[PDB]
Amino acid sequence: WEQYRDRVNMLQQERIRDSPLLQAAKENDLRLLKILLLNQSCDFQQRGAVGETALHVAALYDNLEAATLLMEAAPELAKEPALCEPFVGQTALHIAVMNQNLNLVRALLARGASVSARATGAAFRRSPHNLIYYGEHPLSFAACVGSEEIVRLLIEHGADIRAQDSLGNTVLHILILQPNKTFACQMYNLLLSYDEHQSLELVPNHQGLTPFKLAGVEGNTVMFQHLMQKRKHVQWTCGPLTSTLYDLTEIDSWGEELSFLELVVSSKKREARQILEQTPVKELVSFKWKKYGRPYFCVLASLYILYMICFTTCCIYRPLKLRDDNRTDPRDITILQQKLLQEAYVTHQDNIRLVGELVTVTGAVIILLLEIPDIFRVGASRYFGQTILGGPFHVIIITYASLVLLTMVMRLTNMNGEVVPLSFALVLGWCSVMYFARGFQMLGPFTIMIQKMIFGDLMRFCWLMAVVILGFASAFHITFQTEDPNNLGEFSDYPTALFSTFELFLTIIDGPANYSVDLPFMYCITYAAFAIIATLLMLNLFIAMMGDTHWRVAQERDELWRAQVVATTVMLERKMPRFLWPRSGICGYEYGLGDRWFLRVENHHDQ
Amino acid sequence: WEQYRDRVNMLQQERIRDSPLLQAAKENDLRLLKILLLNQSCDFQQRGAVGETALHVAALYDNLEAATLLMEAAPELAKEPALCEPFVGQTALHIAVMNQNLNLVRALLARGASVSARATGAAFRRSPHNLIYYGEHPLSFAACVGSEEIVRLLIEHGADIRAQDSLGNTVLHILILQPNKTFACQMYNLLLSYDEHQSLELVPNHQGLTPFKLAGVEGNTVMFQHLMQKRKHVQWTCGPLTSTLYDLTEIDSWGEELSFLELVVSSKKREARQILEQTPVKELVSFKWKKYGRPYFCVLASLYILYMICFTTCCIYRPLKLRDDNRTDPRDITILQQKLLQEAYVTHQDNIRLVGELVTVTGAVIILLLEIPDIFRVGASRYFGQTILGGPFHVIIITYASLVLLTMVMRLTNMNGEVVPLSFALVLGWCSVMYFARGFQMLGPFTIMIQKMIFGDLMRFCWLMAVVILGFASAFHITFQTEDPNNLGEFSDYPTALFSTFELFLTIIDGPANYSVDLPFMYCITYAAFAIIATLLMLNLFIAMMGDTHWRVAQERDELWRAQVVATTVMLERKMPRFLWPRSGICGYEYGLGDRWFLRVENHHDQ
Ligand SMILES: CCCCCCCC(=O)OC[C@H](COP(=O)(O)O[C@@H]1[C@H](O)[C@H](O)[C@@H](OP(=O)(O)O)[C@H](OP(=O)(O)O)[C@H]1O)OC(=O)CCCCCCC
Numbered sequence A, B: 001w002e003q004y005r006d007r008v009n010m011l012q013q014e015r016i017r018d019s020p021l022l023q024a025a026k027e028n029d030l031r032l033l034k035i036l037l038l039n040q041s042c043d044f045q046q047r048g049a050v051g052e053t054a055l056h057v058a059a060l061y062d063n064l065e066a067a068t069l070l071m072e073a074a075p076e077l078a079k080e081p082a083l084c085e086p087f088v089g090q091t092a093l094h095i096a097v098m099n100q101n102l103n104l105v106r107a108l109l110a111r112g113a114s115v116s117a118r119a120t121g122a123a124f125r126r127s128p129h130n131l132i133y134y135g136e137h138p139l140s141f142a143a144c145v146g147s148e149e150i151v152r153l154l155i156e157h158g159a160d161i162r163a164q165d166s167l168g169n170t171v172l173h174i175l176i177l178q179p180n181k182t183f184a185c186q187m188y189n190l191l192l193s194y195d196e197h198q199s200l201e202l203v204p205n206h207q208g209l210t211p212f213k214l215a216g217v218e219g220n221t222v223m224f225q226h227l228m229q230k231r232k233h234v235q236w237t238c239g240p241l242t243s244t245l246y247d248l249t250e251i252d253s254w255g256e257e258l259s260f261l262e263l264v265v266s267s268k269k270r271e272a273r274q275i276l277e278q279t280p281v282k283e284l285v286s287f288k289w290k291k292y293g294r295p296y297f298c299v300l301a302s303l304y305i306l307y308m309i310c311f312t313t314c315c316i317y318r319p320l321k322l323r324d325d326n327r328t329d330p331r332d333i334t335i336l337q338q339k340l341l342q343e344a345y346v347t348h349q350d351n352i353r354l355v356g357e358l359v360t361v362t363g364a365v366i367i368l369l370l371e372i373p374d375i376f377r378v379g380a381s382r383y384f385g386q387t388i389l390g391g392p393f394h395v396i397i398i399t400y401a402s403l404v405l406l407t408m409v410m411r412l413t414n415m416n417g418e419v420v421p422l423s424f425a426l427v428l429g430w431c432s433v434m435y436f437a438r439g440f441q442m443l444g445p446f447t448i449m450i451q452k453m454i455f456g457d458l459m460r461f462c463w464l465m466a467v468v469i470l471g472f473a474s475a476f477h478i479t480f481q482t483e484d485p486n487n488l489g490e491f492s493d494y495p496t497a498l499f500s501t502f503e504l505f506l507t508i509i510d511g512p513a514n515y516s517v518d519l520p521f522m523y524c525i526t527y528a529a530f531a532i533i534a535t536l537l538m539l540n541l542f543i544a545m546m547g548d549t550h551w552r553v554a555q556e557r558d559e560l561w562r563a564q565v566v567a568t569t570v571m572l573e574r575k576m577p578r579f580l581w582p583r584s585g586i587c588g589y590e591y592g593l594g595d596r597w598f599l600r601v602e603n604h605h606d607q
C-alpha cells in the first residue's frame, strides 16, 4: 500500500547513502569526484536498489557542473531508463524538465537523448492516490509546468504534437484538466499555432470525449469563455448597442446520440452546474423552454390527474356482502365481508365501472412498459443518480405500477385480504403527482427542499429518538402489568405500549389519567421525567435543525431552478416523437453560407 | 489582604516623605545633596519602614547622576538586600534591570554587586493576586524584559544558565509562559546557543514537565511551530512537491506512563484545544484512528447492545401470582402479587431464563470491577472533569451497576416492592447506550449539544418556572375545596393539584371543564390569567434560549469532533491489552539510523 511506498523510498535513500561514487553527486565535491574518475576500478554502471544511474541523482539534486564531467565519462548514460515497479522507467529528461534548469537540458539534447519516450509508472497514472497528473511525455511536462523556452526548444527537435497516451489523452486534455488556468490559457493559444502549419481538436479519447466536451463536463468556466471566442463572428456595431451571431455546430450536437446538454447536467462535480449561466447556452435553453416545453408539459400533467381521479372513483365502489356468522365473542367488530366473484356482476350499476377497471389496468401496463427499457440503456446506478435528475420520483411510479398490476392477480383467484395492495397504491398514486411541480416558477425549490429534508436529515437522527422511546416504553409496560385492563386501557400488552408511547412522544394524543380510581406510585415521577426529557427539548432541537436546513437552500433558488428545467427539457425532447419537435437555430444555406446553423443575439453593454 | 498591601505602600511613601536625605534622591537637587554629604552627622544607614537603602530609591526614581555621588559614599550600599515581609529582599539590580538604563547597571557591576541572588517575596511568586511573573534571578529579568545588550553583559560576569528556582522553573519555562511571543522567540534562539559551548532542555520542574510538554499544555502554537523545526529533516525536493520526515522520540512518549496526548487533551485552558490542528500530530492521530480504533470500537458497541437486549428480555418475564384477598373497598385496583421464592422454579419454561439472569449478574459485576480502580489512579475530581473526557456517561454506568447488583439482594430475602430498582435500571441502561455515538462523523455534535443544553441551561432557568407554577397551584387548590369530588376530579387534595398544574403548564393535558353543572366564579379569570402568563410567553422564551444555545455550538463541529476522537483513542489504547496494539511509525534501525522512530509526509505547497 502506501506503506510500501514508504519502504521503497527509505530503501532508495539508504542505498544512495551507501555507495561513495553516487554519493559524491549529491555531496558536490569536485576533488573526490576527480580522484574517482582517475581510477579504472570505479565503474560507470553502479545502480541503486530502485532502477537508477549516476546521472539521475546528479540531475535530481540540481548539480549541473557535477554532471558535466560525468557527461564525458560515457554518452551512454543519457539513454538507460529505470527498470522497477513504482517508476517503470524514466530518463534524465523527465527529472530535468521539472527543475527548469536550461543548461542541463541543453547538454542532454546535445548528447542525443530520446526526444519522446513513454513512462507509465504506478506514480504516474491518474488516481486519488497521487497528488499531480501530467501525462507521459517530455513535451507534456514542458507544457504543463509552463516554460515556453523549453517548449519551443523541444518542439524544434521533433516530438510531434499528435501523440496519444495510456487512456488516450492528448496534450490539450492535459492542459484543460489542470488548475491555474490564467497562466495556461495563453500557452494553449501559443501551442495550437505550431500544428496548423482532421485538425488536432477533433480526435477523442477512449471514453469518447472531445476536449470541448471535456472542458464542459469538468467544470471550468474561464477557458470555456476563452474558447467560445474563436467561433464568434461580429455583425455591425452602431452607437452603444452591438450585434453578434454564434456558430452552433458543436454545442447542440444534433446527429450524435450523446448530446452536450445531457452530458453537462449529469455530472458528479458541482462546478459544472455553474457553467449554464454563460450567454450562448442560456439564451438557447430559455428560448427552447419558452416556445415548446411548457404546453406539452401542461397537457401531460392535466391528462395524468384526470387519469388518477378516475382510478380513485373506480376504487371507492367495491362490492361487499353481509357477514355469514355472528360474532361469538366480544373484542371484535366486523359486519361485512368480501363478495365472491360469481355473484359480482348482475346489474347495469355494476356494469358501468368495468370500463374504469379496464382503463386503469391499461394505463398501468402502458406506464410499466416505458421506464423499464430506459434503465438498460445507461445503467441501474446511473438512472437513480441524484436529485436533479429525478430518481425518487422514478422509483415510486414503477412500484405503484407493480402493486396495481398485482391487485388483478389477487382478485381473480378469490383471495381474501385485498385491502393491503389497494391501500398502498392509493396512497402512492396521489403522493406521486408532486413530480409535476418542476414546470413552475415557485414550487421547484419547495419540492427539492422537502426531498433533501426527508432523505438527508431525519435518517441520521431517528436512532436517538428510537432508543429514548424504547426505554420508557419498557418501563411503562412493566409498571402496569398487575392491574385491571378495564380501568386503564393503554399499556395492556407490549406492542400497544410501544405504539402509544410513540404517539405520546409527538404530542398528538393526550396524557392518560383517571380520577375515579387510584394509580400506583412510580408512574408520576417517570411520567414527569419523560415529559421534561422527551417532549420539550428533543423535539425543538429537531425543529431548529429543520430551519437551519431550510435557510441554506433558500439562498440559491434562482440558480437551482434552471438545472432541473433543462433536465426536464432534454428528457422530454428525447422521449417524444420526432415530428412534433423541429430543429433549432437558423438554416444558413439559403443566405449564402454553407450547411451550418447559427444563433444571434444583441447587447447593450459598451456605455 | 490587599488592604494590607495598600497600607504598606502608603506607609512606605510617607516614610520616604519624612526623612530629608533620602528625599533628596527623588527631589534630584545637587546642592542640598552636597551639603548633606559635607556633614559627618548625616548617616549612610538610614532606612525606610519597609527594608530600604538610599540606593534603592535613587535607582527607583531614575536618577543616575544623583546616584553616582552616593556610589562614592560607600561601596557597601550595593550589597544589602531588604529585610521585610512583602519584599523579602531585593538588591539594586532587581530594580535597575527593569528600567533598562545601561549606565547604572554598568556602575553597579563595576562596584561588584552579587551577580546572582534569589528573591522570594509575596509579590514575586506566581498567583492570580499579582499581575506579572518573571522568576527570581537578574538573568531572568534581563531575558524576559527583552534587552539583549544587558543579557550578554550579565552572562559575561557569571550567572550560570543551569540554575533552578522555587517551583523549579529554569529560564526556558519562564520564556515559554509569557505573552508577546514574536519578540521572545528569537531571543530564545539566541539564549540557547551560549550553553552549548544532559543538555538544558531535558531537566524538568517539580510538577514533572519538560519545557516541550509545558509549551504543549499551556497552549501557545507560535513557538511550538518554531520549536518543531529543529527536529525536521528534509528529503529530496523535485518540482512543486516536497517530502519531509519528522522525528518522533518525544511526541509519542512511549516508555513513559504520562504521555503527551493525554496531557494535552485534559487541560483547563481553551487554547490548547487548538494545537491539535498542526500537521505532525494531526497526521499521527488520523492514521491511528483510521487503521485500528474503529473496528475495535464497533465490535465493543455491538457486544454491548446484544447484552442489553438480553437483559430486557429476561426482565420482562417475571413470576406473578393471583391475589389472596378481595378488594374490600373502592378506590383500589390490584389483582396480582409477587410470587414467593419456594414455588418460583418448577418448569422448563422457568428453567430457561435462569441462564439469562446469571449472564446479567456476571456482566454487572465485571462492569463494576473496571471503573473503580480507575479513580484511585488520578483522583475523584479529575475523573469527572469535563464533557470532552466523558464524565456524565461514566457516572451512569456505575449507578446502573449498583442498582442491578442491589436487585439480587432484594430478591433473595423475599422483600415486596422490587419494581423500583428494576425500573430505574431499565431506564438508565437504555439511556446509557448514547455514549457510543463518539465514533461516527455526524452524531458527536448532537450528543455534546444535548449534554450542554441539559446541564447548562435548564438548571439556571427552572427556579422561575417553579415559583410561577406553585402560586397558581395553591390558588386553584383553595378555590375548589367546597365542592363534590365526583364532578371534577382534579384539584382534590394538594399534591394532585400540584402535579396537574405542572402537566397543564406544558400543554400536554387539556383544560378541565364540565357542562352538565355550574362552576364557581373566580376560576374563569384565574384560568385566563394563567393561560396568558404561563402557557404563551414563558415557554416560547425558553425555546428561543434553546435555539440560541444550538447556534453557538453548530459553528465549530469540525474542530470539536477531533478532540473527543483522540480522547477515545488514548483511553482505548491504555485499557486494552498489549498484544493487539503494535507500535507506530517506522523503525529506523535496519535502514542505518540508530534506535529512533520516524514518520514521513509529503506536501504540494510551493507553487
Ligand atoms: C435501488 C437503488 C437505490 C438508489 C438510491 C439513490 C440515492 C440518491 O440518489 O440520493 C442520495 C443522496 C442524494 O444527494 P446527492 O446525490 O445529490 O449528493 C450529495 C449528498 O446528498 C450530500 O449529502 C450533500 O452534501 P452537503 O449538503 O454539501 O453537505 C450534497 O449536497 P450539495 O453538495 O449539493 O450541497 C448532495 O448533493 O446522497 C446522499 O446523501 C447519500 C448519503 C446518505 C446518508 C445516509 C446516512 C445513513
Ligand SMILES: CCCCCCCC(=O)OC[C@H](COP(=O)(O)O[C@@H]1[C@H](O)[C@H](O)[C@@H](OP(=O)(O)O)[C@H](OP(=O)(O)O)[C@H]1O)OC(=O)CCCCCCC
Pocket: B384, B385, B386, B387, B391, B455, B456, B459, B460
Ligand atoms: C459527584 C461529583 C459531580 C461532578 C460533576 C461534574 C460537573 C461537570 O463536569 O460539568 C460541569 C460543567 C461542564 O462544563 P465545562 O467543565 O466543560 O466548563 C465550562 C462551563 O460549562 C461553562 O459554563 C462554559 O462557559 P461558556 O459556554 O463559554 O459561557 C464552557 O463552555 P465553553 O467555554 O467551551 O464555550 C464550559 O466548557 O461546567 C459548568 O457549567 C459548571 C457550572 C454549573 C452551573 C450550575 C448553576 C446552578
